[PDB]
């Protein structure tokens with residue numbers, strides 16, 4: 001796989017990690033979580049707040065990290081990936097005792113994937129957020145010993161520190177949750193306001209790029225019809241793309257199967273490269289700039305992306321409509337359908353539903369009039 | 384030292400279990416859980432003097448989202464020829480794996496210290512989370528209703544089938560300090576715990592007509608004078624020596640199972656010594672950790688709240704500082720409530736007043752009568 005970094009081998013390895021971050025062009029990351037949940041016309045604000053009130057009690061317990069460095073001689077990319085198992089084992093008797101939530105399906109899913117929970121609960125690496133640390137960098141304040149038990153307590157947060165400070169590009173795939181959890185668990189409680197969080201986000205990560213958003217915009221919008229990470233990996237292997245040669249750095253395990261955070265980062269990163277290369281027809285480039293710190297959005301009316309530099313474009317509601325259809329529909333069906341009106345923007349809501357936005361107010365009205373003669377589906381305007 | 388009953392081997396084993404339940408004199412049970420408390424502290428949850436209704440309510444509000452994920456069951460049958468007890472013990476790993484895409488997706492909570500503790504005991508979490516046995520409560524079962532499906536119904540109820548078996552056999556179920564095991568058990572496999580204690584007491588004795596808590600037994604005459612520590616592991620040691628003797632026990636052919644196996648053995652040692660009807664008085668009184676017990680099958684009691692006062696003091700003090708402060712009133716009984724407070728039980732009701740007056744003149748500590756909010 002990648003490196004299996006657990007509690008018992010965190011310290012001896014840490015430097016290998018720092019080096020990889022420090023020598024990398026960008027890295028791609030991914031999180032595995034304890035669970036997803038204990039929509040539609042939410043303002044980003046309302047989205048944020050729902051995910052805050054309903055997703056953040058879950059534990060990010062496996063963190064994937066894949067560093068990519070471009071070698072200019074062999075025209076290839078060298079990689080290094082890692083699997084960090086993280087677990088808030090209490091430090092002391094007075095140290096806070098974390099209570100996280102588990103979602104049965106998510107657990108059962110990870111079960112179906114060969115995940116090893118023992119590595120998380122028996123061998124997970126500890127960590128501390130901003131407060132827990134500094135509060136304790138005062139307690140432990142006014143021979144050499146405990147100063148080095150401080151570096152043990154913050155434990156995994158050190159690797160986050162490293163990413164945050166490298167000022168290099170961090171790529172994820174549909175990563176709004178990965179980002180949310182990561183600051184929640186390793187920096188501090190998510191703030192009351194979305195504005196407040198966008199600030200907070202870009203100090204941990206200065207440069208974010210969501211592959212799923214990339215795959216869902218021109219020119220990719222027209223050549224790709226499913227943006228699942230698994231399906232995206234497939235589509236970017238065939239023309240008019242070209243999959244970059246990726247080599248495992250000597251002494252790391254390569255891949256040659258089952259989902260982990262590491263693997264998925266490694267894949268996400270490859271996706272990013274393939275889509276960058278196509279765009280030039282580089283990995284720090286100006287071509288990719290417009291994608292920086294715009295996070296992907298799910299199940300939403302007219303927001304194309306979450307802006308992290310803020311604030312977000314208005315919906316322009318009089319452009320949208322809600323459709324319900326046989327589950328047997330695939331994206332091409334939705335396009336071909338509304339093809340009368342030209343390019344459209346899709347946003348899957350269900351397995352049997354999706355939001356569409358049309359080019360003009362007059363158009364919405366019309367597709368509704370047409371649908372009066374169909375059975376397969378139904379069109380809406382205001383719920 | 385039970386059988387490891389997991390998902391993949393539940394169905395083929397089930398009959399062995401039914402039969403042991405079916406041939407047993409009594410069973411001993413024990414649960415391992417996901418966690419003890421969300422919010423409040425350990426002692427904040429076992430407050431020392433607080434009434435059942437208020438206790439039940441606490442534990443309801445603060446313990447029930449935790450997962451009972453390992454069930455220990457040991458059945459005991461007395462053989463009259465060799466004067467021995469025959470045993471059978473089981474370790475069920477249970478996990479609410481969702482049945483369908485429409486079936487409820489359970490959201491249980493974990494407490495890091497509990498998990499961490501279990502880790503230090505060799506617990507295998509993969510057994511729970513990858514190989515845990517599904518199950519459904521009263522509702523879910525009644526409700527997912529409306530060939531092969533008639534047979535996937537009996538797979539979805541899964542573990543609850545074992546609890547049904549115990550509940551119906553009407554035989555005695557012995558636990559050690561078992562109020563939580565009980566509450567979870569019905570919470571997970573029967574239905575949401577009810578708004579009131581009395582509604583719970585009803586609920587409790589339908590699932591289990593005959594309950595006996597070993598820790599309460601060991602905490603009463605004649606055992607009260609002969610035993611000084613009633614922790615299960617300590618209790619198992621004390622009941623080995625005089626004036627007891629360890630039951631002749633044999634099998635047929637740290638886990639919740641093992642714990643049950645021990646729990647039951649304690650019971651037998653204490654039954655033997657007591658010499659049934661001699662045992663009856665203990666039935667369906669559950670142990671309180673604070674008055675020593677719950678119901679008597681209704682209602683509990685209302686002890687003399689008089690002779691007790693609560694104190695606030697600087698954090699640096701210690702148990703012996705506190706004995707110092709109350710020397711005037713002879714030997715006393717303490718229940719630490721927290722970092723800077725404790726309850727103090729004085730001998731005579733009056734003494735509390737005179738303690739209140741003696742302390743108008745001192746800054747360090749503070750005092751109120753138990754009566755306050």
Ligand SMILES: Nc1nc2c(ncn2[C@@H]2O[C@H](COP(=O)(O)OP(=O)(O)O)[C@@H](O)[C@H]2O)c(=O)[nH]1
Nearest residue numbers: 036173174176177212227228229230296297298
């Ligand atoms: N932004 C967002 N992400 C989610 C939500 N629910 C799940 N995810 C994440 O999105 C990822 C799935 O994205 P993708 O691979 O493209 O699958 P798909 O889009 O659901 O078909 C998962 O790894 C989840 O962590 C949600 O409500 N909002």
Ligand SMILES: Nc1nc2c(ncn2[C@@H]2O[C@H](COP(=O)(O)OP(=O)(O)O)[C@@H](O)[C@H]2O)c(=O)[nH]1
Nearest residue numbers: 093425426698699700701702718719721722723
């Ligand atoms: N703040 C404070 N805590 C203490 C002191 N002495 C002991 N403790 C803690 O109080 C708790 C009492 O635990 P224990 O000695 O087992 O008695 P128990 O609480 O009744 O189980 C322990 O977990 C100790 O760590 C003290 O002087 N100050």
